[PDB]
Amino acid sequence: QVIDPTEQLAYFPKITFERLKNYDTSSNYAKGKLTRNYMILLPWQHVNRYNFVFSSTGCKVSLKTCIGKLMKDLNPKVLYFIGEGAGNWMARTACEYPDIKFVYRSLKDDLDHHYPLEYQRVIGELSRIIDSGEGLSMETTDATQKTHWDLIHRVSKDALLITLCDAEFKDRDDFFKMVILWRKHVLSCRICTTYGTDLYLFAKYHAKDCNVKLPFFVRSVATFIMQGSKLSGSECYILLTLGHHNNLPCHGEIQNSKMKIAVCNDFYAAKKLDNKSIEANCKSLLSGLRIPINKKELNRQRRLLTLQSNHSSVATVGGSKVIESKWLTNKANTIIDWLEHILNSPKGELNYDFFEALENTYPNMIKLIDNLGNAEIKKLIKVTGYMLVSKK
Ligand SMILES: [Zn+2]
């Protein structure tokens, strides 16, 4: 009925990152490029995320790990989370800082979560979310709109000391709209102006270009490259504050940092296994999948399929075909074939070198990525990651 947040923090994996402090001029080194082309098609950054269901941003980013000193120095009573979705990042934060209250905002588009479903699952009550965006319109929940920032203080009368943004914007102009509006607020708003200029915005950014200037009076303090970000892209987290503007992180600097982590570092597994979560992810991937996943359980799911496939097409009206239902068995077979491959495969360390091995030792790789959808593949990697951790 009542849980302690500190005990839940063992279900969250250790985070590996790289901080790139924004200094004056340059190193004048003309440093070499590090490249490694991993032959991977699957989202392997979900390998250590088996203990989470709706959102798993907390497995990738953490405030204690990245901006711990700033958290101690500023000592915020309230944290503002924008573009939060199911709120797993906010959930990890609630476990690391058990006395902090939250103001949550997420776009009310009804395509993605606009309620903290993961936070509720991890924390239990939602009592610490003093403002959950309830009763707000689609534009007052959209960080690219002035009205969102105008109603941010409707419950909390604490200044925007630290704002966390994990929104995926359409384009960089939409990101700039958010950053400009944040600046406009922290310099207009009575509450925030009273605190001063020591106000921060820690936002997700995709380093596309080079030498792109931040808006006027918006200075980047540091850039964080996370091990948990999709290898393929150029995603990073940038800590911004008020001050003489500088440049956004460049695609080149990000790639080297991103590459070093992939080549050098292993993914840390969670200290404890949340068996209810793993069960939910297993059932979400394949309906009726039980833990532990072994030869017996995989053959039991194959038995359940072989007896299910032999069903005579009898109903009232021909609306849902058995030939159409054979596509659901096709997906199920694809899943079992992969999990069987994982089970038969040797134990290794959680790294992209071993992941490339797992993928290039599997014959129906292209049939897998063609048959399973993006969310299904993410679920498949959560389950795979559990299987690999369970080994030896
Ligand atoms: Zn304000």
The rounded distance, in Å, linking the Cα atoms of 70 and 376 is 37
Distance in Å, CA 289 to ligand 1 centroid: 48
Looking at the fold, whether 112 and 133 belong to one and the same domain comes out as: yes
Is 185 part of any known ligand binding site? yes
CB-CB contact of 161 with 241 (8 Å): no
Distance in Å, CA 143 to ligand 1 centroid: 14
- Per the entry, the structure determination technique was X-ray
Q: Which amino acid is at 257?
A: S
Looking at the fold, whether 208 and 343 belong to one and the same domain comes out as: no
Is 45 part of any known ligand binding site? yes
Distance in Å, CA 161 to ligand 1 centroid: 9
Looking at the fold, whether 287 and 387 belong to one and the same domain comes out as: yes
Is 55 part of any known ligand binding site? yes
The rounded distance, in Å, linking the Cα atoms of 56 and 156 is 26
Distance in Å, CA 80 to ligand 1 centroid: 11
Looking at the fold, whether 68 and 154 belong to one and the same domain comes out as: yes
Distance in Å, CA 92 to ligand 1 centroid: 25
Distance in Å, CA 186 to ligand 1 centroid: 6
Place of tokens 């008020």: 242
Of the three residues 272, 290, 320, the one that is the final residue of a domain is 272
Q: Other CB atoms closer than 10 Å to residue 326's CB: what's the count?
A: 13
Backbone angles phi, psi at 229, to 5 degrees: -80, 145
Looking at the fold, whether 104 and 39 belong to one and the same domain comes out as: no
Whether a cis peptide bond, with omega within 30° of 0, leads into 116 is no
Residues 6+ away with beta carbon under 8 Å from 291: 275, 278, 279, 282, 386
Count of domains for the chain: 2
Q: Which amino acid is at 121?
A: R
Instruction: Give all strands of the β-sheet with 17-21 in edge-to-edge order.
Output: 17-21, 218-226, 235-242, 200-206, 162-165, 78-82, 101-105, 129-131
Distance in Å, CA 137 to ligand 1 centroid: 20
Exposed/middle/buried for residue 92 (C-beta within 10 Å: 0-12, 13-18, 19+): buried
Instruction: Residue 379: give the domain boundaries.
Output: 32-54+273-392
Distance in Å, CA 110 to ligand 1 centroid: 27
Looking at the fold, whether 259 and 315 belong to one and the same domain comes out as: no
Is 311 part of any known ligand binding site? no
The rounded distance, in Å, linking the Cα atoms of 103 and 90 is 10
Looking at the fold, whether 343 and 309 belong to one and the same domain comes out as: yes
Of the three residues 272, 289, 310, the one that is the final residue of a domain is 272
Secondary structure in 3-state letters for the chain? CCCCHHHHCCCCCCCCEEEEECCCCCCCCCCCCCCCCCCCCCCHHHCCCCCCCCCCHHHCCCHHHHCHHHHHHHCCCEEEEECCCCCHHHHHHHHHCCCCEEEEECCCCCCCCCCCHHHHHHHCCCCCEEECCCCCCCCCCCCCCHHHHHCCCCCCCCCCCEEEECCCCCCHHHHHHHHHHHHHHHHHCHHHHHHCCCCEEEEEEECCCCCCECCCCEEEEEEEEECCCCCCCCEEEEEEEECCCCECCCHHHHHHHHHHHHHHCCCCCCCCCCHHHHHHHHHHHCCCCCCCCCHHHHHHHHHHHHHHCCCCCCCCCCCCCHHHHHHHHHHHHHHHHHHHHHHHCCCCCCCHHHHHHHHHCCCCHHHHHHHCCHHHHHHHHHHHHHHHHHCC
CB-CB contact of 186 with 80 (8 Å): no
Looking at the fold, whether 232 and 100 belong to one and the same domain comes out as: yes
Distance in Å, CA 364 to ligand 1 centroid: 54
Is 149 part of any known ligand binding site? no
Is 189 part of any known ligand binding site? yes
Distance in Å, CA 140 to ligand 1 centroid: 15
Distance in Å, CA 87 to ligand 1 centroid: 22
Is 88 part of any known ligand binding site? yes
Distance in Å, CA 174 to ligand 1 centroid: 21
Token pair listed for 199: 């106000």
Looking at the fold, whether 284 and 252 belong to one and the same domain comes out as: no
Is 10 part of any known ligand binding site? no
The rounded distance, in Å, linking the Cα atoms of 241 and 198 is 7
Is 206 part of any known ligand binding site? yes
Distance in Å, CA 55 to ligand 1 centroid: 28
What distance, in Å, lies between the first and last C-alpha atoms of the chain?
Answer: 35
Give the CA angle between residues 104, 72, 159 to the nearest 5°.
45
Looking at the fold, whether 198 and 330 belong to one and the same domain comes out as: no
HSE-CB of 282 using CA atoms within 13 angstroms: 21
CB-CB contact of 30 with 252 (8 Å): no
Is 244 part of any known ligand binding site? no
Residues 6+ away with beta carbon under 8 Å from 326: 309
The rounded distance, in Å, linking the Cα atoms of 323 and 320 is 9
Distance in Å, CA 58 to ligand 1 centroid: 26
Of the three residues 272, 300, 317, the one that is the final residue of a domain is 272
Looking at the fold, whether 268 and 387 belong to one and the same domain comes out as: no
Distance in Å, CA 380 to ligand 1 centroid: 42
Looking at the fold, whether 181 and 155 belong to one and the same domain comes out as: yes
The rounded distance, in Å, linking the Cα atoms of 335 and 339 is 6
Beta bridge partners of 164: 81, 202
